[PDB]
Amino acid sequence: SVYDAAAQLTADVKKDLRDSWKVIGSDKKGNGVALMTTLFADNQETIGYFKRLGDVSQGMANDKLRGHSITLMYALQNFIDQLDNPDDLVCVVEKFAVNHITKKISAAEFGKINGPIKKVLASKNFGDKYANAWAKLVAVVQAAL
Amino acid sequence: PSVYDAAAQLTADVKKDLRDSWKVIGSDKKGNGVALMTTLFADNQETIGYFKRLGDVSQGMANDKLRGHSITLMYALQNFIDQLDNPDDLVCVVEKFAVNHITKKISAAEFGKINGPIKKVLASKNFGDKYANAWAKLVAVVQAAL
Numbered sequence: 001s002v003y004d005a006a007a008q009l010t011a012d013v014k015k016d017l018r019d020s021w022k023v024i025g026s027d028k029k030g031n032g033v034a035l036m037t038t039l040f041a042d043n044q045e046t047i048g049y050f051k052r053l054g055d056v057s058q059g060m061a062n063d064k065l066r067g068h069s070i071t072l073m074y075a076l077q078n079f080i081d082q083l084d085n086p087d088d089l090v091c092v093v094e095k096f097a098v099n100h101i102t103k104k105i106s107a108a109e110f111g112k113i114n115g116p117i118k119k120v121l122a123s124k125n126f127g128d129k130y131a132n133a134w135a136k137l138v139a140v141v142q143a144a145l
Numbered sequence: 146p147s148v149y150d151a152a153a154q155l156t157a158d159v160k161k162d163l164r165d166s167w168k169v170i171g172s173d174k175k176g177n178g179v180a181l182m183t184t185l186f187a188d189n190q191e192t193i194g195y196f197k198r199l200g201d202v203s204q205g206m207a208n209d210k211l212r213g214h215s216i217t218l219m220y221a222l223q224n225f226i227d228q229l230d231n232p233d234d235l236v237c238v239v240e241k242f243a244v245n246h247i248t249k250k251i252s253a254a255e256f257g258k259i260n261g262p263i264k265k266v267l268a269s270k271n272f273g274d275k276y277a278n279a280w281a282k283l284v285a286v287v288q289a290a291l
């Protein structure tokens with residue numbers, strides 16, 4: 001199932017993922033927080049899952065939120081690094097899905113991250129082409145949820 | 146023992162030794178990650194109980210779940226190393242990381258067992274006691290949060 005989703009990650013898709021990540025991943029704290037704050041802004045309901053982070057309205061200044069945001073970016077770093085080996089990508093994606101499954105986060109709920117990603121990419125001038133590529137990576141994760 | 150006091154123990158040379166060694170160790174996350182875990186299970190079989198979900202841990206690299214876990218583990222260390230410049234970021238990242246281990250009832254003493262495996266992997270790459278002690282200091286920051 002996850003393997004089949006990984007099949008959509010074509011040579012061109014992987015190329016666009018790596019190129020956009022080279023920029024997005026160069027500032028994990030800044031872009032990580034931008035992703036989370038954008039998620040909370042466009043989908044306020046997702047805040048219910050982050051009660052532990054406290055006052056998320058403080059953004060970057062919130063240590064727990066900042067801590068979570070930075071860490072989030074390293075999961076993506078992991079995924080990006082495993083792109084050329086489907087076997088490694090799959091085992092890493094399934095390992096990652098375990099905690100989210102135990103947190104009762106469905107594939108549809110997880111998919112809400114696509115909008116924030118598209119916006120963050122656009123702020124760096126990466127158009128729809130790149131947003132679509134990323135939606136495909138997110139789809140691999142959704143397949144495991 | 147507070148995490149803020151522990152983070153202050155990461156002096157200039159300790160940080161430098163961490164970076165120099167990670168440059169080599171972090172080059173092969175899959176290989177070194179798996180070697181780290183297998184060594185932990187070999188030197189401290191009592192810890193295997195915490196990893197029931199991984200299945201047959203003796204299969205090593207062949208075990209997909211163990212491999213997935215091992216690779217991921219290395220990115221958490223990558224995270225710590227990248228935050229060495231800012232004590233505030235290192236701390237929030239460490240406490241974040243401590244949450245899931247606290248939930249699995251992993252104590253500071255239990256976590257400290259990783260020091261053995263780290264020392265052996267380092268030695269296999271010609272990094273001696275100086276570096277093992279540097280890593281022990283980093284591990285201590287996490288212990289202070291458990």
Ligand code: HEM
Nearest residue numbers: 046049050052068071072075076099100103105109110113
């Ligand atoms: C590209 C998307 C995402 C990435 C890379 C990501 C990454 C991570 C990572 C690495 C962790 C920390 C380790 C763990 O506990 O599993 C985490 C925790 C968590 N994630 Fe995800 N995640 C993503 C999207 C989401 C979404 C969309 C939701 C919910 C709507 C979500 C909810 C959670 C929650 C509630 C936690 C615990 C946070 C805490 O209390 O510290 N994640 N995620």
Ligand code: HEM
Nearest residue numbers: 192195196198214217218221222245246249251255256259
């Ligand atoms: C260098 C030290 C270590 C690092 C960097 C590390 C890193 C990680 C990471 C990133 C995860 C995945 C995210 C999560 O579920 O929280 C994890 C999971 C886990 N860790 Fe640690 N860990 C270390 C040492 C230990 C030790 C010594 C134990 C136990 C004696 C331990 C027990 C666990 C367990 C039980 C899991 C869940 C495994 C699974 O079910 O997939 N960890 N660790």
